[PDB]
Design a protein around this motif. Structure first.
Motif, PDB file in Angstrom:
ATOM      1  N   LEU A  24       0.837  -1.176   0.000  1.00 35.48           N
ATOM      2  CA  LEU A  24       0.000   0.000   0.000  1.00 35.48           C
ATOM      3  C   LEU A  24       0.865   1.214   0.000  1.00 35.48           C
ATOM      4  CD1 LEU A  24      -2.754  -0.760   2.611  1.00 35.48           C
ATOM      5  CD2 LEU A  24      -2.804  -0.668   0.077  1.00 35.48           C
ATOM      6  N   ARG A  25       1.898   1.216   0.838  1.00 37.22           N
ATOM      7  CA  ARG A  25       2.713   2.441   0.939  1.00 37.22           C
ATOM      8  C   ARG A  25       3.405   2.782  -0.413  1.00 37.22           C
ATOM      9  NH1 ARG A  25       7.383   2.053   5.025  1.00 37.22           N
ATOM     10  NH2 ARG A  25       8.275   0.867   3.283  1.00 37.22           N
ATOM     11  N   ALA A  26       3.907   1.762  -1.104  1.00 44.80           N
ATOM     12  CA  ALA A  26       4.556   1.924  -2.436  1.00 44.80           C
ATOM     13  C   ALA A  26       3.555   2.469  -3.462  1.00 44.80           C
ATOM     14  CB  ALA A  26       5.103   0.578  -2.914  1.00 44.80           C
ATOM     15  N   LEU A  27       2.348   1.902  -3.506  1.00 46.68           N
ATOM     16  CA  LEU A  27       1.317   2.446  -4.407  1.00 46.68           C
ATOM     17  C   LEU A  27       0.938   3.885  -4.083  1.00 46.68           C
ATOM     18  CD1 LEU A  27      -0.371   2.129  -6.837  1.00 46.68           C
ATOM     19  CD2 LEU A  27      -2.082   0.831  -5.473  1.00 46.68           C
ATOM     20  N   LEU A  28       0.680   4.142  -2.806  1.00 49.25           N
ATOM     21  CA  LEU A  28       0.433   5.476  -2.305  1.00 49.25           C
ATOM     22  C   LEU A  28       1.546   6.487  -2.717  1.00 49.25           C
ATOM     23  CD1 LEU A  28      -1.200   7.471  -0.526  1.00 49.25           C
ATOM     24  CD2 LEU A  28      -0.123   6.450   1.441  1.00 49.25           C
ATOM     25  N   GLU A  29       2.804   6.157  -2.436  1.00 47.19           N
ATOM     26  CA  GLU A  29       3.927   6.973  -2.872  1.00 47.19           C
ATOM     27  C   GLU A  29       3.954   7.330  -4.365  1.00 47.19           C
ATOM     28  OE1 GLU A  29       7.608   5.127  -1.140  1.00 47.19           O
ATOM     29  OE2 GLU A  29       7.908   7.200  -0.405  1.00 47.19           O
ATOM     30  N   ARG A  30       3.662   6.356  -5.205  1.00 49.20           N
ATOM     31  CA  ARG A  30       3.665   6.563  -6.648  1.00 49.20           C
ATOM     32  C   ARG A  30       2.534   7.454  -7.054  1.00 49.20           C
ATOM     33  NH1 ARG A  30       7.218   4.044  -5.211  1.00 49.20           N
ATOM     34  NH2 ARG A  30       8.094   6.159  -4.885  1.00 49.20           N
ATOM     35  N   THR A  31       1.349   7.206  -6.468  1.00 48.11           N
ATOM     36  CA  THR A  31       0.151   8.046  -6.697  1.00 48.11           C
ATOM     37  C   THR A  31       0.370   9.504  -6.286  1.00 48.11           C
ATOM     38  OG1 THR A  31      -1.228   6.073  -6.454  1.00 48.11           O
ATOM     39  CG2 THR A  31      -2.345   8.233  -6.302  1.00 48.11           C
TER      40      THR A  31
END
Length: 137
Positions: A24-31
């Motif tokens: 989740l954190r990796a997706l959030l960061e990219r978003t």
């Protein structure tokens, strides 16, 4: 003296069972990176309330030292007309056509007290979706 903004930034998250805090954190960061926003500027995370627990989202909230609010399916449905990415799995399971988008809007408007806007359509992979909403001012 008009204070325009407690400028508010909320990330709505929808996820499959088991989705890790790190995923989740990796997706959030990219978003956030797409929109030139940093994790440091998030005010809160939002998702749908249900029975299933998501340890991944609670852990992410602890990592961020910021809250995660889980909102009633009924509250999210109020936002159907304003969503950008009308869905299936979501619509089927939750009555809501995008959990990430609806929850981001619904929380932004609840904390912020006026109209919220999505920054763009949600970003999804196989396991999770993230949407970002801000205060229309």
């Amino acid at each position: 003296m008009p204070l325009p903004i407690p400028s508010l930034l909320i990330a709505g998250i929808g996820s499959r069972r088991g989705c890790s805090a790190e995923h989740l954190r990796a997706l959030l960061e990219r978003t956030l990176g797409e929109h030139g926003r940093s994790l440091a500027e998030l005010d809160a995370l939002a998702s749908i309330d249900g029975k299933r627990d998501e340890p991944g989202l609670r852990q992410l909230a602890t990592l961020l030292e910021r809250p995660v609010h889980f909102l009633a399916p009924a509250v999210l449905h109020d936002y159907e007309p304003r969503l950008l990415s009308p869905s299936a799995v979501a619509l089927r399971e939750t009555g809501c056509s995008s959990v990430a988008e609806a929850a981001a809007l619904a929380l932004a408007e609840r904390l912020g007290g006026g109209r919220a806007d999505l920054l763009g359509a949600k970003r999804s992979d196989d396991r999770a979706s993230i949407a970002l909403a801000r205060l229309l001012t």
